[PDB]
Design a protein around this ligand. Structure first.
Ligand SMILES: *C(=O)CCSCCNC(=O)CCNC(=O)[C@H](O)C(C)(C)COP(=O)(O)OP(=O)(O)OC[C@H]1O[C@@H](n2cnc3c(N)ncnc32)[C@H](O)[C@@H]1OP(=O)(O)O
Ligand SMILES: [N]
Lengths: 195, 5
């Protein structure tokens, strides 16, 4: 029993010791379609400037507070800030013209239901950069990082009342409803895509 | 957004 968990945990622990998970993949550090000119970086939260963390928290709250209150979770600043600043947090940040932060993902390498996973805790875009393919590109980066670290899936939570995001994940990206989702036994679904 | 059960 412990042996199976140890092999899973070894892979997670190794991924969490990486320096730049995108070092081998420079093609994914630029997104220049549909009028954008973005550079993308992957850093641990400890590598981000405090003002960048503030921008990311504020964007999450602007985009999500109402939908959190419409869910059973509610929104509390402290809980979300603690989640976003946990030492285990990794970030993909998209910088328009390499200068203005316009989108991010907070993700982790973790164990979920006994499996090594890349868990996507946030994908958040400023309104002006939406519907230009950047969100899809960021999720493709997550899928690539999951593969390169030997994770078994990318996983995330989406509110049922977040209709646009639900269609983005289920239809455009063909994520499945994960077996851990409440619907497979609530205001959200747990979605995943196997590596 | 977030991590449900
Ligand atoms: C938790 O964080 C787990 C993820 S759920 C939270 C998602 N974030 C939000 O809801 C915050 C606000 N929205 C965004 O940050 C972004 O809009 C998304 C991340 C939801 C999507 O990123 P994007 O706008 O860059 O999407 P694209 O890559 O341009 O879209 C590709 C294709 O997906 C479908 N799509 C996207 N958005 C859709 C909406 N609102 N409604 C319906 N369909 C949507 C489209 O098929 C889209 O292709 P096109 O029609 O050619 O644009
Ligand atoms: N779950």
């Amino acid at each position: 029993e412990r042996a199976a968990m140890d092999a899973v945990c070894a892979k997670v622990d190794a991924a969490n010791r990486l320096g730049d998970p995108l070092e081998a993949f420079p093609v994914f550090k630029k997104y220049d379609r549909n009028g954008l000119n973005v550079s993308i970086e992957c850093k641990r939260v400890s590598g981000l400037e405090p003002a960048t963390v503030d921008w990311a928290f504020d964007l999450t709250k602007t985009n999500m507070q109402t939908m959190y209150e419409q869910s059973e979770w509610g929104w509390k600043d402290r809980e979300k800030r603690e989640e976003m600043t946990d030492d285990r947090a990794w970030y993909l940040i998209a910088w328009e013209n390499s200068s203005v932060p316009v989108a991010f993902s907070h993700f982790r390498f973790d164990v979920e239901c006994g499996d090594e996973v890349l868990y996507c805790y946030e994908v958040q875009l400023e309104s002006k950069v939406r519907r230009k393919g950047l969100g899809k590109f960021l999720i493709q980066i997550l899928q690539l990082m999951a593969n390169s670290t030997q994770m078994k899936k990318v996983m995330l939570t989406v509110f049922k009342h977040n209709h646009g995001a639900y269609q983005f994940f289920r239809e455009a990206l063909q994520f499945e409803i994960d077996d851990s989702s409440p619907s497979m036994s609530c205001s959200y679904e747990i979605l995943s895509r196997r590596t | 957004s977030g991590r449900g059960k």
